[PDB]
Design a binder for this molecule. Structure first.
Ligand SMILES: *[C@@H]1O[C@H](CO)[C@@H](O[C@@H]2O[C@H](CO)[C@@H](O)[C@H](O)[C@H]2NC(C)=O)[C@H](O)[C@H]1NC(C)=O
Ligand SMILES: CN1CCC[C@H]1c1cccnc1
Lengths: 400, 400, 400, 400, 400
């Protein structure tokens, strides 16, 4: 259009993109800043990097870019590319990307009175502290700090507007709680002029269904199966294998959790405490199994049963767990031989009785330790999994 | 030639690559948008990112790029590179690339009457929701939203043309169903003017031959092998090893599945349900094996077989399974000696008879549990596999 | 130099890089396009992407870039950088890269008669189909498609020159069979305008020495070792651990092999078929071992051994296998006692004889199944490995 | 603003960005170089690179960019982008990045008296030596070197300012000790002109809590558990499975841990020494277990007990460990029968006595080696772990 | 200053950066090319690339960039950025990075007489053959090729200067032997002109301490531990589990090791063949163990030991290793009864006396195969380890 061509020719006369567009040079240029959250794309726990998809919103008033629509009837707005008009240099101080600025530079929409609009999209990789103390029942607060880089507080009056979440797409792993913001001005060692900035905090809660189904339940089941050694008879000759195999099979779970966790030294993760407790339980299970095995394969006439062992394992625990304790010269020569044979059988009977009593003691010890270990593992698991805050909320929101 | 040089000099005279090429400024500009799918690069289930290879197609009429063929006999079309003529700022809204734009800028072919064609190729990484509820017999819909960033509905009339699939190359893992399009207008918090956009939906059906033959069949085979613990005689003393080793060998499969699957908590994957069911099956098998072994190694004199247990197992289940139940003074001194020996032998015979009864009871329990576990695992696996929709279609389209 | 400075000043006078350097504007400009292969870098089977080091070759005649050597002594060639002259817009069609054009823009060498040479280097990532049916005895063909993006047939006709492989460097993993091409031609539905393009097919053969020595021989050896369970006597007590451990090893081997293979569902690969056959063989061996162990530990009084099993195992297969089958009143009181003892001893002897007969039957079954399984595994391995059409060529080239 | 428009127009008049802003051309331009540390993002031990977030700080004086604020009341500072002003070419010498200069070019703030202030941000990847001799108890010294690439000391003399640590964000893994600066002058063979440069040495101390919890304690506990084979009785038939599975688990642990450390060959790391010691201890325990099992299953008449081992073990070692050492004509024919039976039983009991002797000797050897290995493991672990120069500091600052 | 401003204005008067700065247009421009190695960043065996930190030294004489130093006092050198003056187009021929040329474009220093120095830094990823045959005792020779892309001997004749290693920083894994250069020509068929090229070969020796300690010593120790299977008595019942567990562990060891090596089919690597030999050693040990177990459990009532075995396994082989060979009517009825019992005992003793011979034969085989397998393992390990060249040099330089 001829009007469009004339307006574009007239709007660029003696225009310097290096100057701040203010009618008076002694007042700051008010700029309104806001962002629109679109998607939380990634939360890296190991590298402590948060990846989001946002649209920055910048608005200000330009004094030289004004015209009367009477002389230009058809055209009401004008768009300008990068490098042709003045734009604020607003960056992200918290950036964690090789290019310190990740914004696709689009056009600038202008009023017929000089109201510039800037909506640059882009995927932002910011570095925020990730707390894994109560993993996987944790809520994270990651900050996004925005502000002008080279304009002080006397030339650029930054003003914050509320973030817009009307186009937010659920992540499916993180539940968004909110995104407040606040404006503050700081002093830097470079200069003696305040530099206002706008900080947005993103609060999200991890959904625990997947982790609960894939890490907590299998460990519970395997630890429960590890108690099955306290039910096998000692004569089966398989007791050590169960404990060893369950220890081996939980080593891989420990290694997996270690590989998915950041190498932080600020606190002990709740899952780490759980796995250490389970390791301890299995270790003492194996120790008790060895003790029972060495009690059951006792050598008759190899020692004397201590009186304390006798009383404690035959009159107290047997009662408490309702145990039931099991229970012419030729003729002369013939007689000598038959008494010898009978005496040999009698000694065999005494030896087998001693062996039976030793085996009964081993069985009593085994059952008592079974009960104690079951109580201990239930208590430890319940306490560890209930210690974390908002665990009831997480359960009621995800599972039920 | 001279005519080409003259035309090129004439066309760029007083041309502003900023203004919209419309004869009347009030009327909008009609731009036809279309897509040409070529290939599907990858479908990142873990990162919810879809990579494609497409050719965008745009067409519009330029008012100033017109000439007469008679005055320039040789030439009929001209081509302009980026930054020399006006082009629409159409870009993909749902972009997962580090840079928000992935198009490769090429030339713009021009009619003799002002028709511009623009076909920029590129590889697009668009973030689309991936549903793994019915993995691997699943169908995924991914959207591609294209629209002008800075031009409203009063300036650009973004029409839609049907997507073209003729140069499409089959992926070999995904089966294309179709790619329809739909145009709509939306309002944004920035501005009081609608912004039309064109959305293309891609429907792909996963081919399940590889995933089936690599995950389902081995798991079924190992689950069936885990039932052999009920055919092993108890005297071999190697029942528990089979169960614990198949438990390990399926835990590694669970690890692989956790590796390939994402970490969403929206739903429980079908493969996760199947693996959990197999886990419970093997755990219950190990528990039953422990019970059977503790039945087999029953200490005689250490207890009495309950009458209810006998009537349940010995003469009821054996009937059900049709199993047979197995089975001068000197001469005096010698007389009591041989009497003592004979009495000892008789007591040994009674003890071995009791032990044989206990062993038969253990065998009966083993047979019952074998039958029950076999029927239960068959029913569970059939139900879980057949619960998925279009499972029969996927089978008949892949295996047949 | 004075002369070359004057020539450079003169040549760029009234020059328009947008203009096509022809003399009549109606006759298409002939461009000769060829290739120069340097090295094959990587063949990504998982991503279906081929990376190569390639030098392009272009040659056209420029009408305006001519001069008389006699007027400019010494100056015989001139060179121009990107953008200062006209260049064909030839780029890879089936490219797989974030930035579509993977070329380095060097200078253009122009002779005194207007002949332009252009050799842009670069590393090209191309998405080509990768068949995996006969992996690792496979030969792959990957296609490279070039051609002008915008210039048609009446303006720019493409001519082919033979590909150059003089500078080729051996890969060490792929054997270059050759690289032919075809100068195709295409017509549209509007106009009789031939659109030409040049395509190059790279045919390579995989060297099988590494894959063979690292996959096939270890698996064959381990499968052969898995057959030793049949030679193991039942009384040892380790007939199940051997089979289950080789099963674990085979499962790990499949898991590690499937990490380098594509997830295509086009066809079942040869290596997958071989692994499936090995798994079936091992599972059947475990089942047979369970049956043999069940036979070995048979209750002497648990039943009667069927006459069919008698006349088969102890009669036919035993002869076939050439196995030898092993095999005053007080005086009356003492008489009764010794008769009782003797009767007990005789019953023990009969039970021992029955157990020995059962054990011999188990041994016969074990040996027969050993022979059958050895034949099965040898036949299956030979048949699976001999099905590759390139197997003889591979074994004659790589190994020999 | 009119005043700033006029000032911008007047300042760029006859200005050449290629010219060094001095007044005599023979005096070096004083430049002050500092550095503001934000956070340490990564320390890659495998690649030996360090990633940090750093704000550069350069300040100098410009002779031409001077104006009187009386004629321009509102204007007090001006800003210029890259390419329109002279900037020092300060680079990172020991950089490790695809682009040798990973800085973001921002505006240059200029005061009214010609004072410049340039603060470009960025993420820097520098190659620094990583010493893993005392891993995980490490203190690292990574150096950053800066300096003009082309400007010499006679034209550009760098000056060092103290590094600023305000605004530092704690890593959570690495503890920052400090970052001291040093300005060094290096001469050439040309001429007596300095070539000053500024170097900063970042000193970090690894926080040894995560590694201590995940590697040292689990391996210590597993090594302690591996000693339980000595308390296991030899009759259980599990004295080797425990040791072999512990050895397998520990070698898996070592091989997986090896994925973290680099392949350097300048020293033997502490963790490698500790793992090797554990390997040796477990192997020797397995050897001793084999020897003990050989002692236990000795043939009753396959040999004779040597006097030397008899006196050394049964006499001296029992004293040490305080172990109690356990333990009508037919009448003639009947006489030889009963005498034969009696002497057979006597031979059986003497063979049993010899077997008991061998078993007791095996038990004594087992106890002695248990004591020896219990001493050895503790001594080796303490000695290896106490060799770190800062072990006490690390423990007292990470645990207490 | 004024003088340098005037000089900068004067030098760019009628300057064309597209022409060689010669004075006759026929004499080639002599260009000196050198190198400055700083660090070897990484050597990749998988993808066969070499990444280094390198400074490129260039120097030539410019005819136009000259001035009288008297007329411009104080000014001695001038600097020009990329694009403002002519620069040689020298680039790496055999590159491996995505951008074919990776050099940071810095300024060019020009003296008063017209001498140009150009030292662009960068990180170069080359592509060189990596010989893995003698792994990990490799000595590599990676070539770097440099040269003008378009200019030839008529225009630009390259020269060579010795590479600079004064700034070298040791890698820690690779020992640098040296880096020699060479200047070579290449005559074309058309034109008898030189085509100078300068190539540098970097020779590095791998440090074997880490690889030895982490791969060779553990493998030898594990093989020695597996060698203990022959000392274990057969009565334990653990002779198979130990061997199979070691086999599985070392198989996973080899599979893990194979990941850090390329799939090159040009030679069989030393580590690969060593692991193979260990594989056959362990497999044969398992086979021998199976044979020994079969001999130990021979049926006493089965076949008869052949005379060949009776001599060779009992006399000859026991002499070879010196193992001593271990070794009224009622009266009639009672007489017949005791005769029967004594005859049964005598038959039992005779039957048992045959199993001792089989057990001694098993012991003889165990000892013989222990000796033979130990000798075989020692010989094979020594031969494979010492076969590689410069093994003595490597061990002396690394371990001492
Ligand atoms: C413009 O900015 C510079 C910042 O360095 C000012 O220089 C400093 O000014 C203060 C007070 O005048 C002095 O105390 C410092 O010593 C100065 N720094 C140096 C390195 O000299 C400069 O004064 C400012 N000029 C104007 C007109 O405001
Ligand atoms: C539709 N566009 C994309 C998002 C907002 C909107 C817009 C409006 C004005 C300037 N830029 C962008």
């Amino acid at each position: 259009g001829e009007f469009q061509r004339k307006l574009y020719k007239e709007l660029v006369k003696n225009y310097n993109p290096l100057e701040r567009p203010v009618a008076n040079d002694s007042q700051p240029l008010t700029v309104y800043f806001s962002l629109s959250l679109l998607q939380i794309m990634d939360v890296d726990e190991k590298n402590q990097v948060l990846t989001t998809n946002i649209w920055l919103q910048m608005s200000w008033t330009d004094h030289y870019l004004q015209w009367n629509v009477s002389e230009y009837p058809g055209v009401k707005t004008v768009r300008f590319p990068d490098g042709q008009i003045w734009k604020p240099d607003i960056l992200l101080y918290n950036s964690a990307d090789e290019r310190f600025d990740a914004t696709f530079h689009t056009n600038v929409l202008v009023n017929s009175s000089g109201h510039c609009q800037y909506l640059p999209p882009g995927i932002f990789k910011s570095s925020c502290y990730i707390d894994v103390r109560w993993f996987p029942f944790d809520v994270q607060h990651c900050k996004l700090k925005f502000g002008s880089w080279s304009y002080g507080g006397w030339s650029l009056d930054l003003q914050m507007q509320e973030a817009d979440i009307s186009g937010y797409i659920p992540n499916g792993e993180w539940d968004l709680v909110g995104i407040p913001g606040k404006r503050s001005e700081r002093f830097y060692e470079c200069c003696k002029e305040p530099y206002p900035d706008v900080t947005f905090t993103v609060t999200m809660r991890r959904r625990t269904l997947y982790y609960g189904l894939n890490l907590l339940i299998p460990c519970v089941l395997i630890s429960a199966l590890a108690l099955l050694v306290f039910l096998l008879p000692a004569d089966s000759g398989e007791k050590i294998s169960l404990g060893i195999t369950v220890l081996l099979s939980l080593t891989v779970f420990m290694l997996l959790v270690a590989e998915i966790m950041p190498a932080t030294s600020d606190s002990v993760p709740l899952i780490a405490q759980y796995f250490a407790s389970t390791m301890i339980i299995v270790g003492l299970s194996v120790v008790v199994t060895v003790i029972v095995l060495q009690y059951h394969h006792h050598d008759p006439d190899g020692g004397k049963m201590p009186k304390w062992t006798r009383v404690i394992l035959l009159n107290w625990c047997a009662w408490f767990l309702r145990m039931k304790r099991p229970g012419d010269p030729d003729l002369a020569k013939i007689l000598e031989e038959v008494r010898y044979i009978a005496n040999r059988f009698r000694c065999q009977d005494e030896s087998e009785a001693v062996c039976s009593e030793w085996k009964f003691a081993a069985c009593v010890v085994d059952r008592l330790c079974l009960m104690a270990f079951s109580v201990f593992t239930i208590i430890c698991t319940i306490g560890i999994l209930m210690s974390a805050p908002n665990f009831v909320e997480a359960v009621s929101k995800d599972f039920a």
